[PDB]
Design a protein around this ligand. Structure first.
Ligand SMILES: [Ca+2]
Ligand SMILES: [Ca+2]
Length: 109
């Protein structure tokens, strides 16, 4: 569970800071949620939780619902947020975010 990996309190506060549509800043989210104090192995564990269909990649649908991954109470990302995140994250251009790509997003926060 996400709350097994990260602190519910940290999650609450990170979600709480990006309540308005278009306010998402992945670096600051990653920082607040506690993903910057996690080992690479824990990072990968988070990734697997986010990859809803276990395809090994975070596709557009899972990307839009990334916050729901952390707390089912969270909003979906707006269109500009999804577009912006995919663009920061997709280095090989397949339109998806793989494990390494996700790890890099986190590491650069
Ligand atoms: Ca997937
Ligand atoms: Ca990719």
């Amino acid at each position: 569970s996400m709350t097994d990996l990260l602190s519910a309190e940290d999650i609450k506060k990170a979600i709480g800071a990006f309540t308005a549509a278009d306010s998402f800043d992945h670096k600051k989210f990653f920082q607040m949620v506690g993903l910057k104090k996690k080992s690479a192995d824990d990072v990968k564990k988070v990734f697997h939780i986010l990859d809803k269909d276990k395809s090994g990649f975070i596709e557009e649908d899972e990307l839009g619902s990334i916050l729901k991954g952390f707390s089912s109470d969270a909003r979906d990302l707006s269109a500009k947020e999804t577009k912006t995140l995919m663009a920061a994250g997709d280095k090989d251009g397949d339109g998806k975010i793989g494990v390494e790509e996700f790890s890099t997003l986190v590491a650069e926060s």
